[model samples]
Target: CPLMVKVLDAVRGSPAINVAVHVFRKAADDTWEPFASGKTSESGELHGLTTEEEFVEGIYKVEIDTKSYWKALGISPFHEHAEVVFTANDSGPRRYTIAALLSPYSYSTTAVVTNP
Candidate 1:
C-alpha cells in the first residue's frame, strides 16, 4: 500500500525525554516483526511514513514508550507505553502511510493512502 494521506503521530516530552517509534504487524498466523521503525524528530513529529512500501495489506500494531521519553526528562512518566493497532488494505491500488502521536496522557494513530 502506498500513502495517500499524512502520517498521524506525535511525541511530547520534556526537553530531555526521547521517543522511539516501532511498527509491527500481525500475520495470518499472528506474529510480530519490524515493519518499519523511526525516531521522532526534534519537533516530535513523524511525517513521512508512506515512503515505506513494505507494509502491505494486513493487521498492524505500533508501540511508543512514553516512560523512556519521560525518563530522558529525568522524571518518572505518567504513562509507561502507548500502543495502537490498525488495519491496512495494502494490496496494490496505491501507497500506504501510517503514523502516531504521543502526549503526556493521550496518544493517537493515523493512516494515509498512497498509490504504487
Candidate 2:
C-alpha cells in the first residue's frame, strides 16, 4: 500500500506548500528509522513514499518539520515539530492517507485507510 501525505493550512483552509515531511519505522531500541522523506508540492501533496515490498504491520511515525514554514509566514511555532504515530495493522496492500493541518501555534494529523 502507498503511504500518502498532504499538508494544509488550518486557518485559511488552503494548501501549505513545501512542508518537509518524513516517515519513520519504530525500531526495537526506541529509536526510529527513516523510511522515506520528501517535501509537499505546491498543491500540498506528497505521494509515493512507501518502499516496503509487503505491508508490514507495525508502528509507524510521520514527522512534519514546520519551522521554516511558520518562520516564512512570520509566526512563532507552538512547537518545532509535529510527530504523529500510527499503526499499520493490515497485512496486505492498502492505501493510507496522512493529512496534516497546520497553523502558527499548532499542528495535527489525521490518518485514513482507503481501498487501492
Clashing residue pair totals per candidate (backbone < 3 A)? 25, 0
Q: Which residue pairs come into collision in candidate 2?
A: none
Q: Model 2, stretches more than 4 Å misplaced?
A: 52-55
Predicted model with the maximum lDDT: 2
lDDT of 2 at 105: 80
Q: For residue 31, what is the lDDT in candidate 2?
A: 90
Candidate 2, 1-116: lDDT as tens digits: 37888889887788989899988988889798878889999899997787546446768888888877888888777878788888885666667888889988877788888766
TM-score (C-alpha) between model 1 and the true structure: 0.62
C-alpha lDDT (0 to 100) for residue 67 of candidate 2:
76
Q: Candidate 2, 74: how far from true, in Å? A: 1.2
